[PDB]
Design a protein around this ligand. Structure first.
Ligand SMILES: Nc1nc2c(ncn2[C@@H]2O[C@H](COP(=O)(O)OP(=O)(O)O)[C@@H](O)[C@H]2O)c(=O)[nH]1
Ligand SMILES: [Mg+2]
Length: 290
């Protein structure tokens, strides 16, 4: 069998130091990680494990790949994120009796596992103090053909409503702060729950609809870059025939290679930016898939 897990390179600005945790059961030094709970997405599990094992709150940034290791029951697969500490503090807990904050070179020597050193090597390979643009395809909204009335007003269905609710924890894991939605009800409804959680208004985006994008893709590219340049971590909820065009264009321009890809309803692209440059493009499956 295969056990899905998530973890992080937790880091702080002491000047970058990384957290290394000691687990006395095994007597080893590692990166924080743990298994996904039922219904949990990898990013939400990573943030929870950071809090349970280190005592810190954090904001996830760039994805740092996956590590597979054998366990008695079969295989454990762990997706890792860079995670900047935002608060909290370490007190000993069930799994961890010691935490040390080390510069990356010293942390590399402290780690027990070759695959944790590979993760830390990926961490240092690019900027970590990043901002994040979260591009979300709206949730499930039934069929255009079975809908009577303006297609623009077609609402989320029950499943899509559930996806919208499940996206709050996932987008908050990345420190979402500002909200944008293509001019379609189904796009606004996907981030409505997040708008209530943040108490933030959704800015309507006429240029990022399928129809607008098809007629004027250059206006849409320029609008994406403008949103990306504003302070904060914006969420942009749009449509299936818009997102691949925008993501592939930006990744080809920046020479960024996405490790995963897809375009499902409810999916999220985490775009990591440093000083205006794209440095990561991480596709997350819908919260009720995978
Ligand atoms: N190769 C490898 N083994 C690990 C790692 N973490 C834990 N283990 C080993 O895998 C087994 C299960 O540990 P773990 O995955 O932490 O699960 P838990 O301790 O039951 O929560 C134990 O033998 C661990 O020593 C790792 O990063 N790599
Ligand atoms: Mg283990």
């Amino acid at each position: 069998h295969t056990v899905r897990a998530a973890g992080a390179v937790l880091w702080r600005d002491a000047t970058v130091e990384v957290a290394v945790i000691h687990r006395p059961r095994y007597d080893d030094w590692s990166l924080p990680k743990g298994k996904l709970d039922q219904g949990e997405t990898e990013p939400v599990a990573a943030a929870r494990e950071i809090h349970e094992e280190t005592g810190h709150t954090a904001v996830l940034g760039r994805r740092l790949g996956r590590v597979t290791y054998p366990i008695p029951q079969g295989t454990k697969r762990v997706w890792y994120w860079a995670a900047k500490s935002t608060g909290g503090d370490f007190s000993p807990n069930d799994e961890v009796d010691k935490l040390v904050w080390l510069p990356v070179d010293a942390a590399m020597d402290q780690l027990q596992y070759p695959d944790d050193r590979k993760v830390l090597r990926r961490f240092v390979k690019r900027p970590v103090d990043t901002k994040t643009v979260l591009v979300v395809r709206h949730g499930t909204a039934g069929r255009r053909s079975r809908y009577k009335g303006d297609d623009r007003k077609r609402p989320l269905d029950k499943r899509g409503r559930a996806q919208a609710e499940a996206l709050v924890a996932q987008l908050m894991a990345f420190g979402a702060t500002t909200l944008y939605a293509a001019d379609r009800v189904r796009c606004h409804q996907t981030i409505e729950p997040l708008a209530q959680e943040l108490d933030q208004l959704i800015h309507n985006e006429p240029l990022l609809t399928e129809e607008a994008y098809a007629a004027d893709h250059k206006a849409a590219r320029k609008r994406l870059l403008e949103i990306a340049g504003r302070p904060g971590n914006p969420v942009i909820c749009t449509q299936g025939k818009v997102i691949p065009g925008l993501i592939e264009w930006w990744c080809e321009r920046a020479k960024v290679r996405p490790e995963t890809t897809g375009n499902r309803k409810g999916s999220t692209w985490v775009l990591s930016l440093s000083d205006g440059e794209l440095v990561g493009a991480d596709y997350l499956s819908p919260p009720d898939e995978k």
